[PDB]
Design a protein around this ligand. Structure first.
Ligand code: GTP
Lengths: 373, 157
């Protein structure tokens, strides 16, 4: 049984289970307010620096926390936040002075000494079992015509690489608000279909070996490719009855829209086409570039093959046997235990009805209570 | 329910006409010289669960008997003991199901199944409610839902 020959009710019920898992596994808004007041406190502690390179230092967020695509990781209690500090008086300066300046500015505060571990992309102020804070120091790029955000970042190898976070993020925030056409049936959608493909990736690494555990696909090259696949669906003006064929067609155009040109794989930015987000794909020491083109396509085959295994199961005991292998053992047990504390409450409230022609019980003609023995 | 005692136990014909208003039925006979009603059909618990065939037999003065005929339930029980079963019938095969607390265990005199209520409103949603807890007995090894009392001596028969 295939997932495209199913009716719409089973398909959108499967997609409702996927969105219920993603709405469980994400980051809540009270924690967002605590993270926001915490990193604004780090930014005001940077702005009172006596060094002249540290003056006019401002911090805006980047990564998944700007696009609302944050997912709790596998076997990890704590989330991860990443940020960029932009310094206009450090444009003349080198990277070692700004690294020692940010390091001394968080060396002045003693709680930021007792809550610190280092990382090569920037200093990490980890906390006690709640979340992490990351930062990255960067200059401004002068001499280029751009729609927005000209910037260099600190890299450990070449000592000044390039990025362009906020124009790429506003490109996502302009494409994400557009809703496609729907047929007549007789947190946005692109923000959610990225997030279920990240959750499928963690349980995919529970069975693969240790060479494919390094070679699982990195999370920003999955982010930009489905943004490419969503622009073509809007430009084609097609309509969709379901919300699982917006996940299956986007995954189908996901290998066709990564464009290799003159032998080098280019998944770039629309605002700044210089730096390569698939430069990780492109390197060919010990044939590692064919290894992350093989292991992306193996996950592309297994994110269509396990969507036929949920459609091949009969029994409600085998529905949660198959969805145990998609999400892990623990988060399917929270969704299952909610589903018959609603059903045990439906016997006492009388909300549980049963149509005889379809046969199936529906939980929102009242059944009497205390039926078993 | 505090109900009047003016309503009598009702005969074969009133639940004979009542069973045709709901659901698809294969055959609905009357046998043993206008005594025993018989119903079988296709009953599904939910959208993704299995296909079941139940069987309903009624006589006046006797409680009704529900028994699932297909599938056999012991191969998918995995040869371990299924609880909430009565002693089995000698005439038709299958596993007999329990659906009610009887008259001798109640304190007000009115049983959970009464003779005033008709057949199709109550006992086939209770059979679908037994089947909705039957396949969630599996994957956890427990009977979460309604449960019997832990009686020290009483057999409930
Ligand atoms: N290589 C690279 N990845 C980035 C950059 N900015 C964001 N990401 C990625 O964004 C992806 C998904 O977002 P998150 O999982 O929330 O990122 P994160 O766990 O907060 O990342 P860290 O704070 O650095 O630990 C991760 O895989 C990051 O690698 C970047 O400038 N370079």
């Amino acid at each position: 049984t295939t997932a495209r020959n199913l009716p719409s009710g089973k398909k959108q019920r499967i997609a409702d289970l996927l969105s219920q898992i993603i709405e469980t596994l994400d980051l809540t808004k009270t924690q967002y307010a605590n993270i926001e007041s915490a990193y604004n406190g780090v930014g005001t502690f940077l702005s009172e620096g006596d060094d002249p390179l540290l003056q006019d230092a401002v911090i805006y967020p980047q990564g998944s926390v700007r696009l609302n695509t944050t997912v709790k990781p596998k076997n990890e209690e704590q989330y991860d936040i990443d940020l960029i500090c932009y310094l206009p008086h450090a444009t003349q300066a080198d990277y070692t002075g700004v690294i020692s300046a940010i390091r001394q500015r968080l060396e002045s505060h003693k709680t930021y000494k007792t809550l610190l571990s280092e990382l090569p992309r920037g200093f990490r102020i980890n906390y006690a079992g709640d979340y992490h804070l990351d930062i990255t120091p960067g200059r401004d790029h002068t001499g280029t015509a751009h729609p927005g955000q000209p910037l260099w970042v600190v890299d450990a190898q070449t000592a000044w690489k390039e990025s362009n976070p906020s124009g790429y993020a506003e490109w996502f925030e302009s494409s994400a608000s557009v809703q496609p056409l729907r047929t007549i049936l007789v947190k946005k959608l692109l923000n959610h279909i990225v997030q279920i493909l990240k959750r499928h990736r963690d349980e995919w690494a529970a069975e693969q070996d240790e060479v494919r555990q390094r070679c699982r696909p990195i999370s920003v090259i999955i982010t930009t490719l489905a943004c490419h696949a969503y622009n073509h669906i809007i430009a084609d003006r097609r309509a969709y009855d379901n919300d699982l064929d917006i996940l299956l067609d986007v995954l189908e155009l996901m290998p066709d829209f990564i464009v290799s040109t003159q032998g080098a794989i280019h998944v770039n930015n629309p605002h700044m086409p210089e730096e390569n987000f698939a430069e990780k794909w492109n390197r060919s020491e010990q044939d590692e570039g064919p290894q992350r083109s093989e292991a992306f396509y193996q996950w592309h085959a297994a994110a269509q093959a396990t969507f036929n295994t949920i459609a091949a199961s009969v029994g409600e005991d085998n529905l949660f046997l198959s969805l145990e292998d998609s999400f892990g053992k623990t988060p399917v047990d929270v969704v299952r235990q909610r589903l018959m504390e609603h059903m045990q409450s439906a016997r006492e409230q009388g909300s549980l009805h049963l149509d005889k022609k379809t046969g199936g019980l529906i939980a929102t003609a009242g059944v009497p209570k205390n039926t078993f023995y | 329910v505090v109900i009047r005692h003016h309503c009598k136990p009702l005969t074969i014909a009133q639940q004979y006409r009542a069973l045709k208003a709901g659901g698809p039925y294969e055959r609905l006979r009357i046998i043993h010289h206008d005594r025993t009603l018989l119903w079988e059909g296709w009953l599904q618990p939910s959208l993704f669960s299995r296909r079941y065939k139940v069987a309903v037999r009624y006589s006046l003065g006797t409680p009704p008997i529900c028994v699932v005929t297909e599938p056999d339930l012991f191969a998918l029980a995995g040869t371990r003991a299924i609880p909430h079963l009565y002693p089995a019938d000698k005439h038709i095969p299958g596993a007999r199901l329990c659906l009610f607390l009887p008259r001798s265990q109640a304190d007000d005199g009115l049983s959970e199944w009464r003779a005033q209520l008709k057949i199709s409103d109550t006992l086939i949603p209770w059979a679908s409610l037994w089947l909705f807890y039957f396949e969630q007995w599996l994957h956890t090894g427990h009977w979460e839902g309604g449960g019997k009392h832990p009686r020290p001596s009483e057999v409930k028969n």
